[PDB]
Amino acid sequence: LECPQDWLSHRDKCFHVSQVSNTWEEGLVDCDGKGATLMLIQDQEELRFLLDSIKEKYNSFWIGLRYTLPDMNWKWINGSTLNSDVLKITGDTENDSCAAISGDKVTFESCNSDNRWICQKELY
């Protein structure tokens, strides 16, 4: 019983890092199609192991954590409303944020960001 070919083995899990960057949803669907899921982090060690095997400590990798927000009237810190032109490129219609590993932290980022992603399989 080994991890599939080209998957990284660690403790009870197999990991695979995506070839391309894309949105969170594209990652979630990609992992599904592999009989896998986006990475669920059990502890910081796991996070450190991955990041040190990949050698991209700055980059962001999508993981399996997301929240949605109700519809929001976005305003600048001075109280002025964002105008039409800027709203066209601000966040996503879905108003979701998605977790990504970066460094040795987990940060939430708009889900339409293009990031690589990490899929996981449980061996045991």
Added chain:
Amino acid sequence: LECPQDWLSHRDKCFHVSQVSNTWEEGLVDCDGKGATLMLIQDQEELRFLLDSIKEKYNSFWIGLRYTLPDMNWKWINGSTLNSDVLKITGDTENDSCAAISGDKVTFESCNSDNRWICQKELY
């Protein structure tokens, strides 16, 4: 009437990009201390001009837009709760997300990210 020394001039505004990366709040306080504010984007042209004068189209720069979230019970996409060890490095206690320019989009990112920031002054 010129922009201060070392500020970038554009249309009715002067811009200054921070020397170091730090959290959103440190940016907001830094701009204040300069008689300035974090960048408020009037339109995509402005965004393009900055990004093309700086020549860091990938990087994230804080701007003057932020939202807070109520306290949240974070769960993984499979419904399992994040454990203690992972919660220690996931987002920020404040549970805020902050806007940053990247590429030619505005993305929301956890406010404890270390990004450079852009301050603005209005000349007219």
